[PDB]
């Protein structure tokens, strides 16, 4: 994975592997996913990026950048639940993560 | 765009720009798109890849590889109409076009 790997790509790599479901999982509702252990997801992102001071406060800023741009949505009334947006315009952003 | 740009990424770049709608367009039904001028799409792909003998016969092999793998679907009873699949597993394939 490249130095400029997107958080969203890293999350999808984690989500694709059901052996990770103890800390992050597709919920089964469409493109919805849950961060079951948010600080563990952040720790793993820190390892990926060689940023040992990574934490969920930091990681969550990027989730918010994604949902403000309509690439993800934050699921209302839930904690730590997000979804990928299924839409022509969002797909362009995904197609060109660089 | 990198030497290893995927056809699907190239198509999304074309589709994102509505000034291309005379040869390729999102149809408005979800993630469905139509190749209005299939040989023009192929000509442009040939330019992108410096493959001047490109044509739609060749390009369409890749569309078929994508739909056989469940990354796209071919729309039944239609000519030149495809859709991107909105699904956890397909998204992993999109996330890692390399």
Numbering used by the authors:
A (entry chain A), B (entry chain A): 337 to 434
Recite the paper's sentences.
The Ets transcription factor family consists of 28 genes in humans containing the evolutionarily conserved 85 amino acid Ets DNA-binding domain, originally identified as a viral oncogene (E26 transformation-specific). The Ets domain is a variant helix-turn-helix (winged helix) structure, comprising three α-helices and a four-stranded antiparallel β-sheet. Here, we present the crystal structures of the Ets domains of the entire PEA3 subfamily (Etv1, Etv4, and Etv5) together with the structure of the Erg family member (Fev). Furthermore, a new Ets dimerization interface linked by a redox-sensitive disulfide bond is identified, and this dimerization is shown to result in a significant inhibition of DNA binding, potentially linking Ets transcription factors with cellular redox regulatory mechanisms.
Crystals were obtained from constructs that contained the Ets domain, Etv1 (encompassing amino acids 326–429), Etv4 (encompassing amino acids 338–470), and Fev (encompassing amino acids 42–141). Etv1, Etv4, and Fev display the typical fold of the Ets domain, which contains three α-helices (α1–3) flanking a four-stranded β-sheet, with an additional C-terminal helix (α4). A comparison of the structures of Etv1, Etv4, and Fev in the presence and absence of DNA allows us to identify conformational changes that may occur upon DNA binding. In Etv4, in addition to three residues Arg-397, Arg-400, and Tyr-401 adopting different rotamers, the C-terminal end of the recognition helix switches from a 310 hydrogen bonding pattern (which is the form adopted in all the other ETS structures) to a more canonical α-helical hydrogen bonding pattern, although in this case the difference may be due to the fact an ethylene glycol molecule is bound in the vicinity. Analysis of the contacts between adjacent molecules in the Etv1, Etv4, and Etv5 crystals reveals a conserved potential dimer interface that is distant from the DNA binding surface and is present in all the DNA-free and DNA-bound crystal forms. This interface is centered around contributions from the N- and C-terminal helices, α1 and α4, with additional contacts involving residues from the β1-β2 loop. Dimerization of Etv1, -4, and -5 is mediated by the homologous cysteine residues (Cys-416, Cys-422, and Cys-449, respectively). Similarly, dimeric Etv4 and Etv5 also bind DNA with affinities that are 2 orders of magnitude lower than the reduced monomeric forms (note that the Kd values of the dimeric forms are rough estimates, as saturation could not be reached).
